[PDB]
Amino acid sequence: KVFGRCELAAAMKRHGLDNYRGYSLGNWVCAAKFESNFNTQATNRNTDGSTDYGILQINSRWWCNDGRTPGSRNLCNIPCSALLSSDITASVNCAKKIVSDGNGMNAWVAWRNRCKGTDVQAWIRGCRL
């Protein structure tokens, strides 16, 4: 399924992402916009054999296990298939572990390239939160 901007903002707030590790809600919505364009089903294959899964494009080399990725660490201890759900719970739970890894939201290149330093609050204006 494809989330609407405001619909996702509400779900992420519900799951405690607003100000999680110091990042306001807008940051998370902005990251989802440029990582997957709010698409919970998106996947992308990489040159290293890994695959990025879901709305937050979580990588199979370090975070989830898809069983076909060389050097997998599965630091979120979850199958990657769980990240392709309409329910964003698994993705948010893993994202919380990723951002606590010392790199902050830099773990998401799209956020780094298009959200960081911008008016991320724009992503939640107009929303009923």
Swiss-Prot record:
<feature type="disulfide bond">
    <location>
        <begin position="6"/>
        <end position="127"/>
    </location>
</feature>
<dbReference type="GO" id="GO:0005737">
    <property type="term" value="C:cytoplasm"/>
</dbReference>
<feature type="active site">
    <location>
        <position position="35"/>
    </location>
</feature>
<dbReference type="GO" id="GO:0005783">
    <property type="term" value="C:endoplasmic reticulum"/>
</dbReference>
<comment type="subunit">
    <text>Monomer.</text>
</comment>
<feature type="domain" description="C-type lysozyme">
    <location>
        <begin position="1"/>
        <end position="129"/>
    </location>
</feature>
<dbReference type="InterPro" id="IPR019799">
    <property type="entry name" value="Glyco_hydro_22_CS"/>
</dbReference>
<dbReference type="GO" id="GO:0005615">
    <property type="term" value="C:extracellular space"/>
</dbReference>
<comment type="similarity">
    <text>Belongs to the glycosyl hydrolase 22 family.</text>
</comment>
<dbReference type="GO" id="GO:0050829">
    <property type="term" value="P:defense response to Gram-negative bacterium"/>
</dbReference>
<feature type="disulfide bond">
    <location>
        <begin position="76"/>
        <end position="94"/>
    </location>
</feature>
<feature type="disulfide bond">
    <location>
        <begin position="64"/>
        <end position="80"/>
    </location>
</feature>
<dbReference type="GO" id="GO:0031640">
    <property type="term" value="P:killing of cells of another organism"/>
</dbReference>
<keyword id="KW-0929">Antimicrobial</keyword>
<keyword id="KW-0964">Secreted</keyword>
<dbReference type="GO" id="GO:0016231">
    <property type="term" value="F:beta-N-acetylglucosaminidase activity"/>
</dbReference>
<dbReference type="InterPro" id="IPR001916">
    <property type="entry name" value="Glyco_hydro_22"/>
</dbReference>
<keyword id="KW-0732">Signal</keyword>
<keyword id="KW-0081">Bacteriolytic enzyme</keyword>
<feature type="binding site">
    <location>
        <position position="101"/>
    </location>
    <ligand>
        <name>substrate</name>
    </ligand>
</feature>
<dbReference type="GO" id="GO:0003796">
    <property type="term" value="F:lysozyme activity"/>
</dbReference>
<comment type="function">
    <text>Lysozymes have primarily a bacteriolytic function; those in tissues and body fluids are associated with the monocyte-macrophage system and enhance the activity of immunoagents. Has bacteriolytic activity against M.luteus.</text>
</comment>
<feature type="active site">
    <location>
        <position position="52"/>
    </location>
</feature>
<keyword id="KW-1015">Disulfide bond</keyword>
<keyword id="KW-0020">Allergen</keyword>
<dbReference type="Pfam" id="PF00062">
    <property type="entry name" value="Lys"/>
</dbReference>
<dbReference type="GO" id="GO:0016998">
    <property type="term" value="P:cell wall macromolecule catabolic process"/>
</dbReference>
<dbReference type="GO" id="GO:0042802">
    <property type="term" value="F:identical protein binding"/>
</dbReference>
<feature type="disulfide bond">
    <location>
        <begin position="30"/>
        <end position="115"/>
    </location>
</feature>
<keyword id="KW-0378">Hydrolase</keyword>
<dbReference type="GO" id="GO:0042742">
    <property type="term" value="P:defense response to bacterium"/>
</dbReference>
<keyword id="KW-0326">Glycosidase</keyword>
<dbReference type="InterPro" id="IPR023346">
    <property type="entry name" value="Lysozyme-like_dom_sf"/>
</dbReference>
<protein>
    <recommendedName>
        <fullName>Lysozyme C</fullName>
        <ecNumber>3.2.1.17</ecNumber>
    </recommendedName>
</protein>
<dbReference type="GO" id="GO:0050830">
    <property type="term" value="P:defense response to Gram-positive bacterium"/>
</dbReference>
<dbReference type="InterPro" id="IPR000974">
    <property type="entry name" value="Glyco_hydro_22_lys"/>
</dbReference>
